[PDB]
Structure formats: C-alpha cells, structure tokens
Symmetry: D2
Subunit: 461 residues, 4 copies
C-alpha cells in the first residue's frame, strides 16, 4: 500500500459509523498530519468486507472476523487464556488448542492486512495482547518494515508464563518486533529473562529504565529493543473539561440526589476480576460494621461498565459483587437511603467526569492492572484540589502516583485504615497530595508517552 505509518489493533478506532473520540487515535493525530497513516483492525461487526475506508486523516483497513473467530480468538484465547494468565492467574486460565489455532489464524489475517496497507520501509505499531504473533508474522512477510509492539497489560513472571503450552510461539512472536514496550520496567525485565530462559537468547542484564536505559535481546543479526513506557491520558484536555459549568452543576446535583452526604466514595471500573471491586465492598462493609464509617453521612458509588458477558468468570464476578451490594444495603442502609449505589451500565463521558468531580474519595483497588487510567483521570479532574485517591500498589499507576494513599489490596486491615484516613484527611493534607499528583499527571501525559515510544522505535532504524 501507500501508508508510511500503520497502527495495528484488535479494533478500528470507530463506533457503530463514526470515529471514536479520545484515546490512542487522538494522541496520534498530530503525527497523522505529517504521515500517510493507516489503521488496521476489526470493525466490530461479523463477516464484513476488507475494503479500505478513507477518513481523510487516516485510512482504515478492516479485518474480516466471523462471530466464531471472535469467540475463539478473542473471547477464548485472548480473554480466557492470556488475560487471566498475564494478570497473576487471579482466575484459572483455560488452555484450549482450538482457541490457540484460531488465535494464530486471526493474527496472520491482521499481519496480511498490515502488509497490504504498509508502504516500503513503513513504520508499524502493533497494539496489545491479542496480537502478539503479528510482529514475527509481519517480519516474515515484510522484512523491510520497522515494527514496534506495546503491551497494555502486565507481562507475568516466568513461573506463570511457562504454563502456556504455546509459550515459545508467543515469545518468538513478540521477538519479531524491533521494539517491545511495556508500561513498567518490571514487565520489560520479565521479558528479558524469559528470552534467556525459554529462547536461549543473549540479553542485556541491567535494570530497565523508564523511557530510557533500554534492554536488548540479540536475535541472530538483529537486536530487539526492550523498554518501559508508562501510558497516560490527555491530562490537559480532561483538566479543561472538568472545569465546565455544566459538569460542576451535575456534580452538585449528584450529591443532592444522594441525599447530600458529607462524603462520597467512588469506584469506576470496566467490570473485571482484576479490578478489586470485591475488596472495596468488603472493606466498606467491615468499616460500617465496626462503626468506623458513619452510615448516615457517607455513601459509596460503584459504576461498573459491562464487560465480556460471554465469559463465565465475569458472570460469576458480577454475581458476587451484586450480592455484596444487596447485603451491605440490607444491613446498613435505610429505606430511601442506600449506603451503596451500584450501576452496571456504560456511563456517558461527561457524566463520568461529574462523578470524578463529586467524589471525595476515589477507590482504585485492582488486584493487578497494567496501568489504570481512571486513577489519572480523577487526578486530572480535581483542579479544585479536593478529593483523595486510594490506589492499589498492584497498578502501573502506583509507580507514578506515590502521593496517593497506596494500599496492598490483599491487606484488608490496611485498606480499611486507609479508607478511613482518606475520608477524614485535613483539607490541607488532601490539597498537598492532590497538587503533587496533578503536577505528575499534567507533565506526564499521553503525548509524552507516544512520543517516547515512537522516538525509541525510530532509533532502531
């Protein structure tokens, strides 16, 4: 094709159609103004055509997937094999050969679509865990290409990764890239060690820096660069949006509809067993039982956005959470006044922002998370410097947001102590922490992240 910069991701950046706002596609916008850019991905509808769609600023190359392809490659291998394994086997991975075979077939299809789109010597950026085979496949089809890969989820320790029957094929797949990136040095280091242990490659031995001090894996003639690039958000855009009059009015109205509580705790997560939602509810229930939280003036709002309903583990998790909600309200609420409000539905963006602005305490307690953007979005929204962020150590965000109230979600006693501390912090201490968090998040945004990855990738030429 005629594209000199190509993004490859599981989905096209569109909504059933119009171009989806925010996210990655928006971060790459000023680069697409200087490159002939293409995006390869599944359009979210089964058995579509693979004819290029030109969005003026971007050419879209759709990948044809059947509903069966999605079930086995995505719902199956990606979400029920790789996802639990890479997140410290919080649930038991399912190892299924038919899923693996479809994962391979689908990955090859993405590689072929990429080759179609990519001009000679083009730069290719492959995204995330569903497409780990693409770099090697693409290099085999197109050795002229410069290929980066970024993993948006954690890379597990070798002891767990080795369970995968197709461990070598996945590792070889990633090693097809010129640059392999992770959010954290820890992931990068796991990858280097895996390369020595499983593949027998020569690697660098030093610690991996942040956006610097890169690792290397020697693969025959070529070197694979390995780095840590912690993703972020468009901090300035969110900061601006959260100041809008209508947002502030909605935040006030939200507190009124809750019966004007003195304190609001907020959870916002795509529903997932990685997110530690059960831990928040348990801590909140025990604090109420112990009379350490006032059931008359404190309320917890949990917004869970629907996710992967076709995967049994997620249905079971939804059942457990919903029981806890029912239980806590039955024990500590009053008719007309729950202590927990729980919604299981997508939330409009401006509604989400209003909740961030209304919340006195943001509860972000994942058991394991690659980064977690919600923690950073909350911070970017609190230009009033109010609020408090309670944040699990087991998120990538915790490496940057050390001024938050950090918790080990497995240490329930300390999660409880910490929620009480956040609820009762002095105004001045709250401001001190929020000012420091905002300096970090405003300076380290999605633009810095993308530039850093692309600079590293360009240097491999």
């Amino acid at each position: 094709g005629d594209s000199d910069f190509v993004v490859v991701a599981n989905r096209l950046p569109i909504d059933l159609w119009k171009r989806s706002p925010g996210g990655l596609v928006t971060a790459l916008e000023p680069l697409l103004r200087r490159r002939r850019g293409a995006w390869i991905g599944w359009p979210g509808i089964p058995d579509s055509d693979e004819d290029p769609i030109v969005d003026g600023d971007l050419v879209l190359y759709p990948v044809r997937l059947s509903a069966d392809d999605v079930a086995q490659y995505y719902e199956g291998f990606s979400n029920a094999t790789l996802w639990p394994l890479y997140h410290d086997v919080i649930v038991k991975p399912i190892y299924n050969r038919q899923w693996w075979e479809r994962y391979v077939e689908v990955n090859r299809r993405f590689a072929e679509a990429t080759s179609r789109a990519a001009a000679r010597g083009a730069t290719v950026w492959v995204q995330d865990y569903q497409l780990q085979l693409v770099p090697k496949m693409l290099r085999e089809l197109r050795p002229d290409l410069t290929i980066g890969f970024f993993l948006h989820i954690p890379f597990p320790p070798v002891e767990l990764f080795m369970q995968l029957p197709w461990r070598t094929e996945i590792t070889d797949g990633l090693l097809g890239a010129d640059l392999v990136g992770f959010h954290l040095p820890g992931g990068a280091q796991n990858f280097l060690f895996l390369a020595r242990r499983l593949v027998g490659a020569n690697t660098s031995r030093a610690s991996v820096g942040v956006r610097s001090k890169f690792g290397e894996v020697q693969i025959g003639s070529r070197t694979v660069k390995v780095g840590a690039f912690p993703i972020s958000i468009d901090s300035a855009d969110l900061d601006r949006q959260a100041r809008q009059r209508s947002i502030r009015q909605r935040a006030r109205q939200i507190r009124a509809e809750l019966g004007n509580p003195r304190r609001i705790l907020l959870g916002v997560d795509r529903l997932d067993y990685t997110k530690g939602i059960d831990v928040r509810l348990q801590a909140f229930a025990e604090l109420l039982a112990e009379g350490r939280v006032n059931r008359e003036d404190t309320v917890f709002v949990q917004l869970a956005t629907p996710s992967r309903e076709r995967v049994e583990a997620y249905r079971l998790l939804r059942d457990d959470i919903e029981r806890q909600v029912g239980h806590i309200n039955g024990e500590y609420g009053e008719v007309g006044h729950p202590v927990v409000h729980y919604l299981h539905r997508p939330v409009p963006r401006e509604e989400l922002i209003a909740f961030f602005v209304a919340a006195d305490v943001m509860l972000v307690t994942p058991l394991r998370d690659g980064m977690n953007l919600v923690a950073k979005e909350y911070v970017a929204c609190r230009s009033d410097l109010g609020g408090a962020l309670v944040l699990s150590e087991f998120t990538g965000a915790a490496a940057e947001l050390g001024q938050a109230y950090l918790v080990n979600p497995h240490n329930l006693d300390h999660v409880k102590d910490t929620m009480v501390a956040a609820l009762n912090q002095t105004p001045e201490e709250g401001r001190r922490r929020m000012r420091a968090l905002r300096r970090q998040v405003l300076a380290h945004d999605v633009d810095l992240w993308a530039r850093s990855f692309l600079d590293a990738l360009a240097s491999t030429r």
Copy 2:
C-alpha cells in the same frame, strides 16, 4: 399446681423482661380474667431456673434449656427436620437421630412443666410443631387433663410425612390430644388419612368443615376430635392503630423518602424459603426488562426480618435474595434512585403499619404458608380502601381472602400479569376488592378463632 387453664408453647410470652404485646397472649386475655391461667415455655435464655413467675394475670412456668438443647431440639429437629418437611420439602429435610433424641427429651421436659402447673381436670392447650410429642406424654403423666393441640404450620401430605423415620412417634404424639386443630381442612384431612394408613386407626371419612363438621379418630376407648380453625389477627385493633395521625404522617414521609413514586410495592416477611421472596424479585426484574413496569415511578420495598441465621438454608437464601436486589438495582436503578429497597432487620410495629398504609401493592407470595398474618394485617390497615393484595394460593389466607389477586407463585407468567394488573387497577376496582377483604377480616378475627377452638375442646369433656 393450681392452674385450670394452661398454655404450652416453645417460648414464654415475654421479651428480654416484659410481657410481649399482641399475639396469642393478648387474645386469651379475657379468658385469663375468668381462669387461673398458666403459660409454660422457654424464657429465651440458656440454663435458667424453672421457678414460677407470677404476672398477676398469669403464672409463667419457665422451661430450662441449654444452648445445646436449643441447637438440637429447635435449630435442629424443629427447624431443619420438621419445618422443611411440613412445608412440601422446599429444602431437603435433614434426618438426624441425635436431634430426634433431644426433641424427645425437651418435649418430655415441657410435659413435666405442664403437669406441675396444671390443676386436676385442667384444660391444656399445646401450641405448634416443636411440641408434637407433648400431648401423648402429658396424657400418660396426667390422664385427668383435657388436651388440645393446634398446628400453626401446614400438615404435609402422607407421601412426604412418611419420610420421617420417627413418623409413628410423631403421629402417636399428636393422637394424645383430645382435639387436634389445623388452619385448614386440608391439613385435618391429611391427618385423618395418616391415622388410618400409619396407625391403622378408625377415622371419619367425610370432608372436614371450617370450625365445624369435625373429623374423629378412634383410639381405644377415647375419641380424638380433628378440626380446622383458621387463625387470624386482632383486626379491630389494627384498623384503629392504622388510622393514627402519626402513622399516616409516616406513610407520607416514607413515600417522600422514596422520591415520591407513583406506585410502591411492598413485601414484609420473616426471612424464610417458604415466603417466595425470590419469586417477587424475579417477576419484578422481568417486568422491568420487558418495560411493563415503569422504572421511573415504581419502587419495590422488601422488609425481611432476620430469622434462623444458625441454619445454613437460611444463610443461602439470604445470599440469593441479596444478589437479586443488587442485580436489579444495577440494571434498572439510577444513582440516588434504586427500584428495590431491601432491609434485613426487625421493624418497629408502628413503622410496619406505616409501610402497610403507604403501599399500593402488597406482595404476599409464599411457596407454602400455614396462614400468613401479614396478608390480613395489610387488609385491616387499609380502612381508606386503597391498595391491592397479591396473594399466593399456597397460603392458608388464600382460602379466606379470595377477593385478593390470587397467584400460583410457580406460574411466573401469571405472577407478572397479576402484578401489572394490581399496579394498574382502577380506583373503583381496588376499593371493591379491599372492601370485601375487610368485611372478611374484620368479622373473622383472632377472638373468633380462639373461641372456636376452645369451644371445640370444651365439648370433648
């Protein structure tokens, strides 16, 4: 002793102490004004003395039970063997010989306490399923006594009753009475048939009437009378209480705290798998899913009062209900506005009455219930003639309250159609039904019930 009228029940009519209001003890009040009355029962505290406590109007004979006695006789045999069996094995009965043996021992202890209290030729009224052995034991100790027994729960069909390894001992136990009473002719008829089948006794063959047309079982020289006496409430007292200014004000305030819904559905139950609470929640959820109930102006309040937490079946039921609550609100509620309010705690009497007065639809949907007094209490409270009663056929109350919206709780389609009908009834049709229900309940109260049983018992002399 010196008491010529003696009530025997699992518990003394007191609260940890003061005499408990309402109920049986209040219905017998004008009889105790003419008799030397006694009450035998456990005082609700472990390992107490058995020394008589004179309440001027009544002498209380406490029965000493250890916490272990309560666990095996009551929590065990009564609540985990007899209770599920007599209620159509909604949950699997547990047959345990140690429980049976303690049930026997405890029953003998009640029989001994009774004999102590009862004067020569005295009238004795034994209450309910925990004390089914007492009549035979008492007749053996004291053949001079006139003994009635009333079962407050259903008497199961013979096919189920026969499962009980101690079926003959229980049947013989009841046959020790001069009069055996049930709420319904159906129970009485089951008992007659059981007497022929299991014991080989000669019995009457005709249908058993209501408070009349009694059955008989011939036991050697003596005849056991068998009858149906449907319990009720103090209708006039509740009717009066519900008109109080403070109650009406609270009912208005309740609707305001719910965000002034157009329609309130109400469930009030001691928590129990017999009560069909899960069925109401399922019906309500499906109606919301189908858009047949308006999620913006209709709300369901379920008040579940704690019961038998030491019994695993009840903990599991509580878990299922609480999941449904969480689920329904997550799907159809809004932050600040649940469609289901659920409380798991005792409710003050005047608060309960305010809820009856506030509720547009009373949901009483047991899978199986001896009578269900809540259905009658709601009716007695609605002197404004507003409201609507949705009532399971599988309650004793359904035999008297035919003007209610009757449902087969297993017929979920019809339960749903019926809830929509009740919510949308014309004012005039609602009044017609409520007027008819009140005529029944006001005329057939707990005083008529008690008089009828005691007249029948006196006639056995």
Copy 3:
C-alpha cells in the same frame, strides 16, 4: 383406520430395525392374535416419515418428532417438569411455558396418529406420563373410542401437583379416558381427590381396591373409572431363563472375577435420582467404617444404566455417585480388590440375569418409584431360593413384596441394620422369605396385570 385395538406410547416397541423383546408388547401378544392391533409411537429417530409399518402381528404408526420436539416435550416437559414433580420433588421441577406448549403440540400429534389407526368403536390404551393430554384430545376427535390410560409412575399428592401451572389442563387430559389406572390405590385416591378439589367433579369416596373396588369420577354424562393395577413381569419366563446352564456358569464366573467374596451385594438401576443409589453407598461406607461389614469378604456391585444425559440433574447425580465410589474404594479397598464395583453402561439381559443369580443381597432402595421391576426380576430368578431382597417402602413393589427386608431409605440407621441382617441371615430364614416372595411374583405376573386392566376397560362399554 382398520385397527380395533390400539396402544399409544412415547416409543414404538422396536430397536434401531427389529421388534424389541419382552416388556409390554410381549404381554399383549396373545391379544394381538385375536385383534387387528396397532401401536402408535415415536420410532426414536428425528424427522422420520409417518407411514404405517406392518409387522404382520401388528401395525406400527410412527410419530414424526424433530430433535427439538424431543428436547422440549420429552427432555424438557416430561423429564424435567413432570418426572421430578410426580416423584415427590426430589429435585426441583422446572416450569417452562415453551416446554408446555411443545408437550401440547406433541400430544395432539399422538392423538391424530391414533385416530388415523383406530377403527370405529376401537379400544385404545394410552401409556404413561408423556401422553397425559391424549385421552381428552382423542375423545374430542373420536367420541366413538373406548379409551384407557395407565400411569407407570407415581401420582403425587395434591399439595405438590397443584404447583403445576398447567394442572387443570393435565387433569382434564386424564379425565378424557374411560379408565384411568395407577399401580397403587394411593395414586388412584390422589386422583379422585384432585378431581374434586381442582375440577369440582363428583367422585366416589371409598378406598380404592387392588384390581377391584374401583373409584369413579362423574364428568357430565359419562363416568370415568379409576383403578389400581400393579404392573409385574413375565415371572415364568424369567424363572425359566435363570435356570439355564450358561447363566449359572456366568454367575459362578462373576464371583470368581470378584475374588470369590463370601457375600455380594447388587444394585441394578436405570440411573435416576429416584433410585436411592446414593443411600446404598452411604450405608455401605458407614458399615465399613464401623467394621460391621467385613471389607475382606464382602463386595458391592452397582450397575447403573445410562439415562437422560441431556438433563443436568442426572449429570450431577452421576457425579455424586462416582465420587462416593471412588471414596469408598480409596478408604476400604486394596489394590487389586475394590469393595465397590461400579459400571455405567447398558448390560446385556443374560448378563443381568447372571448377576441376579450371583447376588446374595439385592439392594433396591428408591426414594420413590412407581413399581420397580428389578425387585420382582430378582425374586423370579432365585428358584434356588438363595439371596435376599432389601426393598424400599417407597416403591410400588413394597405393597406386594412384604416378605422382603423393607426399609425407609431416609432412615439410614435402619437401612444399615437391615443390610447387616440380610448379609447375615440364616439359610433357612433366607429361604422362607424367598419362597414367599416367589409365590407372590409367580402368581401375579404381567399377564394378570394386563388382563385386569383390559377387563376393567372393557366393562366401561
């Protein structure tokens, strides 16, 4: 059509084809020698033709059923609604409207096939619980027909039957017959009472006899006869077969292959939660634990023939039984010598007979069973007068086989005492019981049963 005697049953009497041996079709053989006989049923293959197949002695009228029809009418309504309900809700019935609707449609299809086959004034005999609507449907299409119906499973008490949302349609369905038969007087009496209670029909009030003293239900102009006819086997044929040299040799070989135990206990059941297989295993395990059975010279063989694998309750039951087997052998067996041998597969007829002949104790312990033919087959096989039958009271067979060791399967203590008694009986006592059981079974065979039902049906003309 031109058939003056027509049998209607869920399946044709054939095997995927050849005419299936034994059973009903063999009992009717000398009647088909005098009548133009027809058989209506599903041929066991999906979407077949409905063209008559003449077997010289019989005309076969196949009913076309799709795999979906079978799933909803049979696997669904028959096996997951009616079956658990009629067997004292050992598992929870599922009430599903789509299943009911297919059950109706399929029943009408059987009725139409019947009408096609049946000559004017013909006698029709409809079999069993899958076809309860057929008599009324058939009478509506063909008021000239004489119609009998026999239920091969128990008829539940009214308290349970009333759960069925389509209770009235089923009752009306059965009332379409001239004669409704059950194995036991108890079923007949339940039906009479149901007729009064649900339908408001006038019925007889006396006890129902065995093959005599029939009940009646008055339905407008016509009377429905109600009777008890306990099914049996071809006792003489089995008695003869069990004496064959090859059978006796196999029985000896079976004992040798088991390591020549002193005592063999045997269970033979179509796998079903009604059969009380779990109870036998529990009793056997506790006896071994208590050292009351000798683990060195006593062995239990359980033959479970596969049944209804598409129904979840049966898969769960299979899992529980298989755990008990594994557990008991792990605890009390030796390598090379299990104390329990368990097979889950169909057994050839002559192999089954050899096991009957080898077994010292036959364990037939259903929680609830219409008759249970295995109990009678064992007896018919023991012309040597050896062996012992342990038999649940909750089978129809227990009403005729009172000389067996009868047990309440819920009374585990007594089941255990009884198994020890059977294992250790004197030769003379064993013979006394087996002689008496054989007199009953040899005199009361399937020929007496069929004649009695057909005589009763003929008398309705």
Copy 4:
C-alpha cells in the same frame, strides 16, 4: 546449651516414641558422630514439656505447641497462607492476621528453644517455610551464631510474593541467615531480586549456579550468601533395598493381583493440589476414550497418602480426584477389573518400593513442586533398568532428570502423547533413559546435598 551443631525444623525426627528412619536425620548421621548435635522441633503432641531428650547420638529439644497453636501457625499460616502462595497460587491464599500473629509467636518459641540448645559460636541449620522468621529472631538473641536456612518448597516470583501483607517481615526474617538456600537457581534469583525491590538491599546481579557461583545480599556490615542446593535421596540405600528378594516377590504378586496387566502406570503422592493428580486421571481417561490405551491390558495405580485433612482445599481436592476415579472405572472398567486402582492411606516403605519395582510407567506430574523425591526414588529402584519416568517440568527434579519423559502438565495433548510414548517405548530406549537417570541420581545423593550446603555455610565464618 552445649550443642555446637543444631537443626531446627517444624517437627522432631521421631514417631509416636522412636527415632524416624531415613530422611534428613539419617543424612546428618556421620556429622553427629563428630559434633555435639541437637534437634529443635515440635514432638507432634499438644501441650508437652520442653525438657531435653537425649538420644545418645543427638539431643532433642521439644517445642511446646497447643492444638490451637498448630491450627493457626501451621494449618493456618503455613499451610493456607504460605504454601499456596509459594506454589504459584494454585489455590487462593488466605490472608489472616491472627494466623500471622501466631506464626510470629511460634517462630519466636523455636528461636528461644534453639538458643537454649546452642553453644557459643555454634552452627545452626533452620529448615523450611514454617520457620522463616527464626533466622532474624535468632541472630537478635544470639549474634554469635552461624545460621543457615534452607527452603524445601519453591520461592515464588516477586509479583506473587508481594501479595503477602507481611512480605517485609518474612524477607527480613530470611535475611537473618548467613546462608539462604533453595533447591533451584530460580528461587535464589527470585530472592535476590526481592531483596533489591522490597528491602532496597545491594545484591549480586549474576545468575546463581548449582552448588556454586553463589549470590550475595549486603545487609549493613554482614553479607548473606544465597545458593541453590538441589535435595536428593539416599540413592545407594534405595538401590540396595529394591534388590531384596521379598521386594521383587511382592512386585510380582502386585501384578498378579491386578490381573496380570501388560502395563502398570503408577502415581505416588502425598495428597496435594500441587501434585497434578487430576491431570494424570484426565489424560488417562481421554486416552481410554480415544482408544489410544488398551483398557484390557493397562492399569493405573494411584497411591495418595493422606495430608492436611483439616484444610478445606485438600478435602475439595480429594472429592475431585475420587469422582474422576469412580467415573473412569464406571466408563472403561469391568466388574472385577478396574482400570484405575486408588488408595488413600499411608503405605509401608517396603510396599512403596515394591510398587516402584512393579510399575512400567511412573507418573510424576506436579503443577509446581520444590523437588519431588518420588521421581528420584523410582529411578534409584530400577536397577533392572526397566520402567519409564514421566515427569513435570514444574518440579525441581526436572532440572536434573532431563532424560525422563518431560511434560508441561498444562499441555494436556502432550501429556497424553507422552504417556502413550512411555507405555510403548522400545526396551532399548527405556534402558537408555533409565541408565542415564540412574547415573545422575546415584552420583547426586542426599549426602552430596548436605555436604554442599554445610560447606557453603561454614565458609561464611
């Protein structure tokens, strides 16, 4: 005290008393001949005295533990917190503060007993995961002591270890030793990294060798040596024992009692979810289903020795295994001939050896195991060079026994292919592998292991 060499372990080396044969205490025997040796541990009985017991060759210092101490320190913290966590969270660890507190208290008690026994400047060797706090505690009480610690179970990756709320206290605890040893370089390397990440200590960065190329952690003034020392058995003793006439006769008799199969597969494990017993049964069942194993001449014997019955996870595992056994025999066995023989009981040593000698295929398929001595015992027993070892990669043994048939137990397809390969290997190929395995195991025995650890520990002086 007066002991210059002291072993500290959870239990004394005795049996309820007499000195237990084999194991560690036997390996140290020629060292105790030159040192004043002591052993500190719990005597296995609750609330005993702590008075020294002199065994002439050894002084025993008993530690007083109550049954409650054992429940919280051992059954609780050791077996339900540490054990699952260190074994790649195959089951979910339970984090309980009361368990942690008892673990601390008990560890301090072991430290005090040690100090009592240990002479000035004595050498102390602390054993295993129940006693990880002892080295730091002991160094604080007795800075004169030389302290080694060896972990017999895996040391998990940092991502999992970090879950532990008391992660720092455990790490500091181990860092109290002069020498910290693991079976594998991988564990040692995890420990070094943990030291940098959690404690901020300076460590060596190179790979850790086997019994050489040691790692180091700098802790203030002192250096902690870190090493890999793979445990083994008394290879020569077992080799000798397995040649005994009575053992060989028993092995022949075992095959006869199994009905002289052509092939015997054997599993021998302390029952534990780490052991992958479920995987063997699944593979065996699928091979039978596929007809790839002959159900007529191949038999699988699984010997599971009882373990940790008070821990719920182990009861659930026992239930799953026992179901699989029952299921497989019901499907593929015959009466008198199971395809799986399963025993849940301790086996005498000489019986175990006879089974090793009888087995054509040894199935050692743990999901995760520190070493696994059963794999090495089998090899040492096969001086006839017959047999075949199927061995999980996820055992420490797999690093030394590469000539075995290695499998990824999560790769069920390959486990199945491998079992077929082992069952059908040529005699010559079997001998080649067994000869090579025996050279390794005979040369690398428990004496080499103990000498190597003690030499490393002595060098820290």
